[PDB]
């Protein structure tokens with residue numbers, strides 16, 4: 024897997040479209056090593072290819088596969104307010120669930 | 135090493151540049167036959183390369199203004215047809231053709 028980060032921020036729909044344009048997908052760390060690699064390529068908070076849109080509190084990748092490895096920041100996921108169904112990687116490498124309509128950098132994943 | 139990825143949609147060069155740079159890469163510029171073949175492997179149809187003779191006609195440089203050495207022009211090219219062809223695409227046989235920068239083609243991005 025190869026990881027590339029975007030320079031501008033955008034909502035998840037646009038993030039997905041960007042990675043897909045070059046035939047990749049939004050980055051999904053499957054272990055601590057990939058998590059670190061993604062963190063390093065990201066210069067700020069960035070979207071991961073994980074969501075609990077289909078079923079609340081059931082996080083899966085963009086292809087429907089339930090994720091096994093997680094690295095939730097203390098207190099997360101909390102689905103605050105009207106809801107948070109997307110996921111971002113913070114600058115310390117931990118994850119936080121956020122509204123999919125909010126804008127962050129995106130890290131794309133390629134094989 | 136360099137990694138190459140092809141786009142799914144077609145677009146003019148300026149847009150191709152914007153796409154590749156959005157992920158901090160550049161439009162693919164093969165520096166030898168091996169890289170040219172690697173770009174061929176990912177491009178399913180005619181695609182833009184990061185080469186132009188926009189500065190001086192018939193003097194081809196990569197997008198950073200660096201004059202290229204290796205070229206793989208299709209027979210009869212570059213011919214700068216009509217009002218001008220200052221951009222370059224990789225044909226499906228691996229050979230190159232100069233085309234209008236305003237015409238749309240797939241784009242192959244390059245990363246390292």
Ligand SMILES: OC[C@H]1O[C@H](O)[C@@H](O)[C@@H](O)[C@@H]1O
Pocket residue numbers: 099101103107119120121
């Ligand atoms: O207090 C943490 C809390 O801060 C904000 O409300 C958002 O970033 C939430 O996603 C996060 O859980």
Ligand SMILES: OC[C@H]1O[C@H](O)[C@@H](O)[C@@H](O)[C@@H]1O
Pocket residue numbers: 211213215219231232233
């Ligand atoms: O005949 C070859 C000629 O065909 C078209 O006119 C264009 O694709 C040109 O760029 C190319 O040189």
Ligand SMILES: [Ca+2]
Pocket residue numbers: 075079080102106107108109120
């Ligand atoms: Ca949720």
Ligand SMILES: [Ca+2]
Pocket residue numbers: 099100101102103107119120121
């Ligand atoms: Ca949260």
Ligand SMILES: [Ca+2]
Pocket residue numbers: 187191192214218219220221232
């Ligand atoms: Ca020309």
Ligand SMILES: [Ca+2]
Pocket residue numbers: 211212213214215219231232233
């Ligand atoms: Ca031509």
Ligand SMILES: [Cl-]
Pocket residue numbers: 106107108109121122123124
């Ligand atoms: Cl949401």
